[PDB]
Curated annotation (Swiss-Prot):
EC top class named in words: hydrolase
This protein's name: Tyrosine-protein phosphatase non-receptor type 1
Any GO MF annotation of the entry: non-membrane spanning protein tyrosine phosphatase activity
Parent sequence residues shown: 1 to 284 of 435
Biological source species: Homo sapiens (Human)
UniProt keyword Membrane present: yes
Catalytic activities: O-phospho-L-tyrosyl-[protein] + H2O = L-tyrosyl-[protein] + phosphate
Name of encoding gene: PTPN1
Cysteine sulfinic acid (-SO2H) PTM sites in chain numbering: 215
Length: 284
């Protein structure tokens, strides 16, 4: 069923809460035993948001390999993503260790450091060229190279140096700065423009490791980003674009991380973004 007609149908009958609860009922439940070990309590932001064991990213260290991060591998679309929580004061070094070890080119941030008067993640990148950051627990150096501030997003060029080997790499930081404190955006236009800027940079392409994407918990806004991207790619690849089923794609992604899409409003917004984005995919 053409999702656009599915959309109007749900909207007129006002059944978004019902659709969304069906997804919650059918979603996968896999163990998350490592996340719940006592030694990892200060590595998790939220008690009820944990990576599954089978898909968690492991840090390359013998001490403690745990980070709250998951590999979402989309086989038909040929895209992979790492979804993670916003870094905590005690996990900023782990976060950049993961970026290094997984060979990522881009980091996608969908939250502000402060929202609703409370801290939603650490200030984990440098704000001035001449004031670099050193992460002593993981032996990395991070320098701000340049910053481009636009009305709806900011893009930063960063240098990450492995101090053990003196190798350096360029990382791109894509920061969507205008998601509202409550609810979802009224129009998907600026979010889609942002997605296309990330695509154009190469950060989603198979010559690099998976993009790292986060918000505060790494499931709501972060789930909207990867769901929209994958659905649009499938519409490009298939003979019949109307065959793409957003609810089925979301359930496939929920095999790899729990809780993706946190509200019925985020589900509706994801439909809207794919419907409006398709009016470029199909050739306009």
């Amino acid at each position: 069923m053409e999702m656009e007609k599915e959309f109007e149908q749900i909207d007129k009958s006002g059944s978004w809460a019902a659709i969304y609860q069906d997804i919650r009922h059918e979603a996968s439940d896999f163990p998350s035993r490592v996340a719940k070990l006592p030694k990892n309590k200060n590595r998790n932001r939220y008690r009820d948001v944990s990576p599954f064991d089978h898909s968690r990213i492991k840090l390359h260290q013998e001490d403690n390999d745990y980070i709250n991060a998951s590999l979402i591998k989309m086989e038909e679309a040929q895209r992979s993503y790492i979804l993670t929580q916003g870094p905590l004061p005690n996990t900023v070094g782990h976060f950049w260790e993961m970026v290094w070890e997984q060979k990522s080119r881009g980091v996608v941030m969908l939250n502000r450091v402060m929202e609703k008067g409370s801290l939603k993640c650490a200030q984990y990148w440098p704000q001035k060229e001449e004031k670099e950051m050193i992460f002593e627990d993981t032996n990395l150096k991070l320098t701000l190279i340049s910053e481009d501030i636009k009305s709806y997003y900011t893009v930063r060029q960063l240098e990450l140096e492995n101090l053990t080997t003196q190798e350096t790499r360029e990382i791109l930081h894509f920061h969507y700065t205008t998601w509202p404190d409550f609810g979802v955006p009224e129009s998907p236009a600026s979010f889609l423009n942002f997605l296309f800027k990330v695509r154009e940079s190469g950060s989603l392409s198979p010559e690099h490791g998976p993009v790292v994407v986060h918000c505060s918990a790494g499931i709501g806004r972060s789930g909207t980003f990867c769901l929209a991207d994958t659905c649009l790619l499938l519409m490009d690849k298939r003979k019949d674009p109307s065959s793409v089923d957003i609810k089925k794609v979301l359930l496939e992604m929920r095999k790899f991380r729990m809780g993706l899409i946190q509200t019925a409003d985020q589900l509706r917004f994801s439909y809207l973004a794919v419907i409006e984005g398709a009016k470029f995919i199909m050739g306009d």
